[PDB]
Amino acid sequence: SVFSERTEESSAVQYFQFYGYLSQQQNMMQDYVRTGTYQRAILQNHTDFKDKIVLDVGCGSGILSFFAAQAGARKIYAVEASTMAQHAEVLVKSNNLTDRIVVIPGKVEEVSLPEQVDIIISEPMGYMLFNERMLESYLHAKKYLKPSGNMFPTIGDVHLAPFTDEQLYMEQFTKANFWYQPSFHGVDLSALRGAAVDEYFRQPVVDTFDIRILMAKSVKYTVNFLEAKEGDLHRIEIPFKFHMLHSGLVHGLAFWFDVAFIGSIMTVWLSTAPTEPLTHWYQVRCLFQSPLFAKAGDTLSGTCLLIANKRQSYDISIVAQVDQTGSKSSNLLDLKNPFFRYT
Amino acid sequence: SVFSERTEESSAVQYFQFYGYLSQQQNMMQDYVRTGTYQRAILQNHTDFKDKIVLDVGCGSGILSFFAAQAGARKIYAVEASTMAQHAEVLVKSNNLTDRIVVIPGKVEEVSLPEQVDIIISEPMGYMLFNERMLESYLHAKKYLKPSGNMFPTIGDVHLAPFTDEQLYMEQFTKANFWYQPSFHGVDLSALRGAAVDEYFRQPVVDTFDIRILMAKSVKYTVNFLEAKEGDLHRIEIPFKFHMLHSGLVHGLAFWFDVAFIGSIMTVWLSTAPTEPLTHWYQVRCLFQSPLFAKAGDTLSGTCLLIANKRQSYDISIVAQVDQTGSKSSNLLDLKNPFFRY
Amino acid sequence: RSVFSERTEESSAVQYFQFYGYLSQQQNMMQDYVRTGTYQRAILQNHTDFKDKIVLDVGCGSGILSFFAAQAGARKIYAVEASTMAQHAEVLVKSNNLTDRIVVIPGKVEEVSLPEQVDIIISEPMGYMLFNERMLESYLHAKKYLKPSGNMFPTIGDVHLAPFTDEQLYMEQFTKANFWYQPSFHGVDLSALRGAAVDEYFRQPVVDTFDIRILMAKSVKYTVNFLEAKEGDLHRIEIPFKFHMLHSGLVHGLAFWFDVAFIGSIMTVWLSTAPTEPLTHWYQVRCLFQSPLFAKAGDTLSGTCLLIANKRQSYDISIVAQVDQTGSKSSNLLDLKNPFFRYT
Amino acid sequence: RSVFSERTEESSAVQYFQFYGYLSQQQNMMQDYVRTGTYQRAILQNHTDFKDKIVLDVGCGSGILSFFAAQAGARKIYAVEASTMAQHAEVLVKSNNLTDRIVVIPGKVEEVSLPEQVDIIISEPMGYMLFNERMLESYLHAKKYLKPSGNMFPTIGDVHLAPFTDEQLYMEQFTKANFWYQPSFHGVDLSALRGAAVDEYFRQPVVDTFDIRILMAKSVKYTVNFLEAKEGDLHRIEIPFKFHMLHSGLVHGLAFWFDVAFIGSIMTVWLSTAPTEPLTHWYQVRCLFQSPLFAKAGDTLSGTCLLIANKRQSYDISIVAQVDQTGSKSSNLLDLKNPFFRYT
Numbered sequence A: 001s002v003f004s005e006r007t008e009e010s011s012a013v014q015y016f017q018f019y020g021y022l023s024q025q026q027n028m029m030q031d032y033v034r035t036g037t038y039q040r041a042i043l044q045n046h047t048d049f050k051d052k053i054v055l056d057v058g059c060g061s062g063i064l065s066f067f068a069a070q071a072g073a074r075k076i077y078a079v080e081a082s083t084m085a086q087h088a089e090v091l092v093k094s095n096n097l098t099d100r101i102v103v104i105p106g107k108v109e110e111v112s113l114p115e116q117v118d119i120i121i122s123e124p125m126g127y128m129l130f131n132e133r134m135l136e137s138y139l140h141a142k143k144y145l146k147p148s149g150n151m152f153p154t155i156g157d158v159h160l161a162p163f164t165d166e167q168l169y170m171e172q173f174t175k176a177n178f179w180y181q182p183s184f185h186g187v188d189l190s191a192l193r194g195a196a197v198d199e200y201f202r203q204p205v206v207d208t209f210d211i212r213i214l215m216a217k218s219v220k221y222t223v224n225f226l227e228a229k230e231g232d233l234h235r236i237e238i239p240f241k242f243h244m245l246h247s248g249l250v251h252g253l254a255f256w257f258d259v260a261f262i263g264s265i266m267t268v269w270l271s272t273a274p275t276e277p278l279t280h281w282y283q284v285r286c287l288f289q290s291p292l293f294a295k296a297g298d299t300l301s302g303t304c305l306l307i308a309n310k311r312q313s314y315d316i317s318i319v320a321q322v323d324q325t326g327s328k329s330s331n332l333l334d335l336k337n338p339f340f341r342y343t
Numbered sequence B: 001s002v003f004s005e006r007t008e009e010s011s012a013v014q015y016f017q018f019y020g021y022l023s024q025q026q027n028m029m030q031d032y033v034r035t036g037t038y039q040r041a042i043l044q045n046h047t048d049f050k051d052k053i054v055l056d057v058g059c060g061s062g063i064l065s066f067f068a069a070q071a072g073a074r075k076i077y078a079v080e081a082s083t084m085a086q087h088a089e090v091l092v093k094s095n096n097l098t099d100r101i102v103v104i105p106g107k108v109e110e111v112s113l114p115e116q117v118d119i120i121i122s123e124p125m126g127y128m129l130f131n132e133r134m135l136e137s138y139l140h141a142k143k144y145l146k147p148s149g150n151m152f153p154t155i156g157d158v159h160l161a162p163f164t165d166e167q168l169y170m171e172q173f174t175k176a177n178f179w180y181q182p183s184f185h186g187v188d189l190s191a192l193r194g195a196a197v198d199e200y201f202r203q204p205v206v207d208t209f210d211i212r213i214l215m216a217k218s219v220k221y222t223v224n225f226l227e228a229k230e231g232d233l234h235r236i237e238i239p240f241k242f243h244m245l246h247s248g249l250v251h252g253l254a255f256w257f258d259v260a261f262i263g264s265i266m267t268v269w270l271s272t273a274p275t276e277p278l279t280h281w282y283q284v285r286c287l288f289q290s291p292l293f294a295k296a297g298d299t300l301s302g303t304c305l306l307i308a309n310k311r312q313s314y315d316i317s318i319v320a321q322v323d324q325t326g327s328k329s330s331n332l333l334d335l336k337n338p339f340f341r342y
Numbered sequence C, D: 001r002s003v004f005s006e007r008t009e010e011s012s013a014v015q016y017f018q019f020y021g022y023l024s025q026q027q028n029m030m031q032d033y034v035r036t037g038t039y040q041r042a043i044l045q046n047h048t049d050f051k052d053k054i055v056l057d058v059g060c061g062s063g064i065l066s067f068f069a070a071q072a073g074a075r076k077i078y079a080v081e082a083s084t085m086a087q088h089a090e091v092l093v094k095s096n097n098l099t100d101r102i103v104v105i106p107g108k109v110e111e112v113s114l115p116e117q118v119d120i121i122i123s124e125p126m127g128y129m130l131f132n133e134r135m136l137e138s139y140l141h142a143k144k145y146l147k148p149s150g151n152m153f154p155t156i157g158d159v160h161l162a163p164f165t166d167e168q169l170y171m172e173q174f175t176k177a178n179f180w181y182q183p184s185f186h187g188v189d190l191s192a193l194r195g196a197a198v199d200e201y202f203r204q205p206v207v208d209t210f211d212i213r214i215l216m217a218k219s220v221k222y223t224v225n226f227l228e229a230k231e232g233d234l235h236r237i238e239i240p241f242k243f244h245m246l247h248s249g250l251v252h253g254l255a256f257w258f259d260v261a262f263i264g265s266i267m268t269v270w271l272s273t274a275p276t277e278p279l280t281h282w283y284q285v286r287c288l289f290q291s292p293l294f295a296k297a298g299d300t301l302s303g304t305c306l307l308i309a310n311k312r313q314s315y316d317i318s319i320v321a322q323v324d325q326t327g328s329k330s331s332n333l334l335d336l337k338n339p340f341f342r343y344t
């Protein structure tokens, strides 16, 4: 299938074991920003659900399907590939909705749905939006969508901004300098210091931060889920040109995302920006290998190229340069193995 | 091979990729109790290494092989299945020990060695001793051991004792009662409340605690690595009979372990007991879904049964009863995925 | 055929009036100096409402209120009491040389026969949460003896309710019920009754005080005008509410207190049991939800508190609360007759 | 119409069985480890008295004693319970897969009908001072279903009486009553009720525990053999005493506790509430003399404790004692139904 062709088996096994846990479903469900905003977007756009056919992609415990039912949906198809499908079907029974919600265990790329739907709902966003590559399953599901159908979320925006954080940059070398000693219990470890440095810099840093470290208005890359094909997410080239608002050393790029539910009554926004209350997505920061000095008014231009891999994640190639000086830096990171720094 | 037969490929991929990271090596090495104790065991028993042939199973970055070299070993075969083996070779060259330390990439169950060895060294202990099933690889390597060869460590003791800790119990209880809500955003979740309790209490709790929470002296279960066969670790039955020293609620069993290096000069112990300085092993507690009440003088009887699984871990079954009252508790735990609370 | 006996089970009335026959209970009430001092102040500072007047004292007990009315110059005070405390009242009236002014009349106010209509009724009819003991209905029944120009002391009653957060109290009651969760109590599986245990424990309103910082929104107020209300009004009391949440957190239930006003000709005197006021023997009352409701600052928590009077001289309380933004709903039933006294 | 109804006022019975309809009261009794542990040990360690036998459990409550009988291998257990707790007991019989061996029979043991005679009766009927609640009479009444060989668990009951000295406890009665001895409480002279307040406090048996060093003489014992006694024997209980004073001092009253023995074929097991044993939910009971009695070590304190059963499921207590060497005499009349719980 499409899913298996693009996914290494070992990665998929571990992936669906993770989401088979009720504690991980709970982790997502008790994030009020995530769960409250979905519910508010569905109910406030009730005319998009009333007496409609709905598809829920990766329903998990089924919480989003229940919101669709609260909005008057005629029939809801909830697809779930992990063993959580058993629990979702339990809740469908206990909430007396067996005539409205039909749980379908299996992968949305492999299961067989009977009819076309009026709207697809799903919560597939991961770290910097694209991690886990579930947006491709979300877009793949549009084979079941009527031509005049809708998508919730309708659009996703990933935001990129430069940041200064001397502490974070220096932290990488303080850790790596563990290896820079000539007699650790009699052993000279210093030959691995370089490898240890490179290891740390390949890890995106997941945590939050104060917005005062941002040095320029963010640049935005939009994916319209109603127009996009899943092939558009195999290679995502995000050019950026930052108009520096502050002078200082730029240590890397910070990432966050927004999604929007463009309904017939209104549009509702779910944001994970650092100017908003913290969510379980946090934010993501990728360091440059060497910082770049930029004056307020200078332009920092470059590209962020996200290349999908068979581990359900991305390799992140960043290239940046200060146009007015030519000073240039770069980095190559592995989003599948981030460093969780939040405390 | 023996390894692949007992290991799901998905688990082994994740396992050896975890141990390919230099940051994890730094973490183990910075456990000063662990590193310092291993060095002392080896150097103070230098006669067991002087001009000997050594095998280091799962050498990682190679630190134990360097200790063997410092103690006078003639040749050290350092086996390592992860990509950390290439980093081990770098250090061997940078420390000018190419004539004494020979890294052998691959699994100890698959590689070939040119000769038998006088002593096997390794650090195979996971959480609760048995996690990761590395002890089976350690014992498997005895096929390379000369008759009357030595093992470092030589024996391992598992200790288990009943504990009381209302705070910990209610902490896990609270996490599961999320699925008790009859109107989470209008949705009745209460039908999954049983499943959630089961899931949350299958997690062993990895952290330290004060010794005063323990309600009886520990029971010891000993594995003699010189005699044990790897088959002995597929199903481990630990009977226990505790004589309660205090009255109160028993919220479960606490686990720790000691290993001894029984060398020709002196015996050196590495302990993870709560009476001893903290290590990266901490201690492990398996909670009961419902505690048992006991009084001082009562006997708490039962069995702890560890069934090894193909995910390089163990399924744990604990059955316990207060003999005087017939109050029984039966619990199942998945050691693979513990809850780190420290 | 008496109004009282028609709404009261015999077994409840017997225990009720035996309880109030004890002098130790009278001492406890009298030693609430907020209560006793505020009553005296409301009467004496409005002495013109009593001077040369005819007074009816409903449920006089040992008779303290009738003595306050005599100090304010009442011409005649009929002191009605249905317990055996009426005999101790008589002793005090003689020993205080007031036999010419205070006439004890033993019996239920719904069953006795007063010699004449009165200018003012005084009573202390407030129980826990105001309504417990259904004494307000005897107080209002007594208006059949009140002149058209007559007054009532107290004149009005305000019930206040507000949502609160108190994880320790919730877990305290939750733990008690968890005993019936044991699958092997001396080898016996009790878990099948765990549901019934939780229902029983959370049926108990909690009587004690608390810090005002646990309250999550401004109180809603329900007012009873004793001068205008009729007995039948108190059979079914419906209190809708809509709270604008001022803090975020888990709503564990609703807290209740009450105020009464003595609206006299000279001044209005208030007796309050609010948690912002000095503590009285009424304390405050909290009704716990079996499952707390999560709310955000700015959300609305709406619903109904409904009190259905029962024949055990108390009320069946049903509370339905709902977070409007999320539709998270909580329904609860409580038995006000048998609260949990948590203050000790 | 029934033995129970002819000796119990309806109002008292209504309140009595409502009390035992609460799971919290069952929990309180079940969590007394001395009570529950000792019954289980007495039943299991005499398993031959139960193995494949027919058993009657009088007032089973939640049914715990019946489950212990089943653990001991009983063939058939009839568990009789008059309160609504009988519905909960049935739930537990089902959930524990014992419906084939335990039959819950809702009703009063004096009014139900059993299908057959039984080999042994089990029950926990002891109240405060052993006799409070008068359920020993229901226990004895049940012997109409017992076989000639049948046994009783408990088999015998001993109530113990001993004189004590406790200045603090005695004085405390006047400290509390002297609230009324003031001439102007908010203008009112309360002093005329001080004597009535004193009398009220002394009528209450004091329920709490104490140091054994307050006892002034070895206890006297009154025994009820449950295999032999009849209901009527407990309507008037006369306990003579002649204490030989071990210490000199003022005797302020009599302390009461009790023991019971399960006399089985294998062994006898004792359940004791004596002040020398671990504390139980029965505590101990002390009845004051309204005037203490001075006695020297070696003197004799002689008198009688008369317990007269009443229709409120309790006893009126009449104690009279005198020091034979001096003639100084004292007495008291106490109401066992309304004890004063002093324990903290």
Ligand SMILES: NC(=[NH2+])NCCC[C@H]1O[C@@H](n2cnc3c(N)ncnc32)[C@H](O)[C@@H]1O
Pocket (backbone or CB within 6 Å): A003, A016, A019, A057, A058, A059, A060, A061, A079, A080, A081, A082, A084, A106, A107, A108, A109, A123, A124, A125, A126, A127, A132, A134, A137
């Ligand atoms: N926002 C995220 N970071 N992750 C959203 C995961 C939500 C649910 O989608 C399920 N899921 C993921 N991929 C698929 C798929 N191809 N088909 C069906 N269910 C899936 C997964 O098992 C989980 O229960």
Ligand SMILES: NC(=[NH2+])NCCC[C@H]1O[C@@H](n2cnc3c(N)ncnc32)[C@H](O)[C@@H]1O
Pocket (backbone or CB within 6 Å): B003, B016, B019, B057, B058, B059, B060, B079, B080, B081, B082, B084, B106, B107, B108, B109, B123, B124, B125, B126, B127, B132, B134, B137
């Ligand atoms: N103290 C522990 N918690 N675990 C000790 C074993 C872990 C180390 O041994 C390596 N290792 C694990 N299994 C094997 C094996 N079968 N063969 C070779 N190396 C192995 C693994 O890659 C890592 O370097």
Ligand SMILES: NC(=[NH2+])NCCC[C@H]1O[C@@H](n2cnc3c(N)ncnc32)[C@H](O)[C@@H]1O
Pocket (backbone or CB within 6 Å): C004, C017, C020, C058, C059, C060, C061, C080, C081, C082, C083, C085, C107, C108, C109, C110, C124, C125, C126, C127, C128, C133, C135, C138
């Ligand atoms: N403040 C309270 N917490 N409860 C209300 C006052 C209680 C007093 O009124 C008496 N009382 C209660 N009901 C009645 C009645 N129907 N008629 C006369 N006295 C009564 C009762 O005997 C006691 O002396």
Ligand SMILES: NC(=[NH2+])NCCC[C@H]1O[C@@H](n2cnc3c(N)ncnc32)[C@H](O)[C@@H]1O
Pocket (backbone or CB within 6 Å): D004, D017, D020, D058, D059, D060, D061, D062, D080, D081, D082, D083, D085, D107, D108, D109, D110, D124, D125, D126, D127, D128, D133, D135, D138
């Ligand atoms: N140890 C005590 N201090 N009291 C014993 C009461 C135990 C149980 O006996 C029940 N019970 C009491 N009297 C009776 C009776 N006549 N018939 C049946 N059950 C009864 C009562 O409802 C309660 O559940």
